[PDB]
């Protein structure tokens, strides 16, 4: 659903 | 004349006196870069860059600093983006990063640009500035990825986001985190980063030791399933089956 880069 | 450095978590710091407040503003204020050498020199209220020039931290005596101005005429100034301006001056690099890294074809079969470093450094070292438009979580993840392929989650109320037509070079320069190429093997992660431009952004730290033209690639850490582009999942599976 997140679509965005993580860390 | 009480010279104070307040460091911050990410090796920058704003040096300088404080006024009768107790708050950096003058025109002898400075941001120094993690480098400890790279500065922006100038004028500052409260903290906040006005007007800075390039300068390099020449020796420090007992906590006051020597700086000495680059040639030319590069100011800067706190530019913070909104959700639809990315940047007053799209084409003014940041100086830091221009010394670091730069953009060629990625080594990675039709990956498009990717980003490389300019010189050999240890781990831990910041490359690269992520910059971007601020938008929300909502706004990025009820859309296509066709729009996401630059998305970075700053915090969980900000995603930062390059959309076109800023993912070009010829466009938008002013910070190239966003060139950077995906790798479940990387040598770089994306770290948080207080910027005098650009204020609470990310930027792209190393891992380990890179050479010169090494190319810089960090993991998108999309979720995965033991949602995320095709090329990201098709990778995924050919990592799988190596190591
Ligand atoms: N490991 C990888 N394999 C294939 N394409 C990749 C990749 N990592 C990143 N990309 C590509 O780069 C995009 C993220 S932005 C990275 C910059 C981009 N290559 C450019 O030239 O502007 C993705 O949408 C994808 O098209």
Redesign the interface.
Known sequence: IKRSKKN | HGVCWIYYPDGGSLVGEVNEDGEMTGEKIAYVYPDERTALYGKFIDGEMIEGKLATLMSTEEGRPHFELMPGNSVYHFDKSTSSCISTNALLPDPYESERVYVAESLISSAGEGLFSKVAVGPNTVMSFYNGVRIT?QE??S?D?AL?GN???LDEET?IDVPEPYNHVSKYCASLGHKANHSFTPNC???MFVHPRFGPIKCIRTLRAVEADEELT??????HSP?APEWYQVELKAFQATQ
């Open positions: 979580h990025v993840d859309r990825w996401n998305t970075l989650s995603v992660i994306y770290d960090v993991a998108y850490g999309y979720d949602e």
